[PDB]
Swiss-Prot record:
Tissues of expression: Endosperm.
Top-level taxon of origin: Eukaryota
Protein's UniProt name: Alpha-amylase inhibitor AAI
Disulfide bonds: C1-C18, C8-C23, C17-C31
SUPFAM superfamilies (UniProt xref): Plant inhibitors of proteinases and amylases
Keyword Disulfide bond: yes
One Gene Ontology MF term: endopeptidase inhibitor activity
Organism: Amaranthus hypochondriacus (Prince-of-Wales feather)
Domain notes: The presence of a 'disulfide through disulfide knot' structurally defines this protein as a knottin.
Amino acid sequence: CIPKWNRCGPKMDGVPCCEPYTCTSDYYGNCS
């Protein structure tokens, strides 16, 4: 997974953010 306020992209990577967090992305966004 990904840290707090760090880039995400699940439709490409398939890696959600680190619990309790979640990716506010599709291709280019960030963990919150």
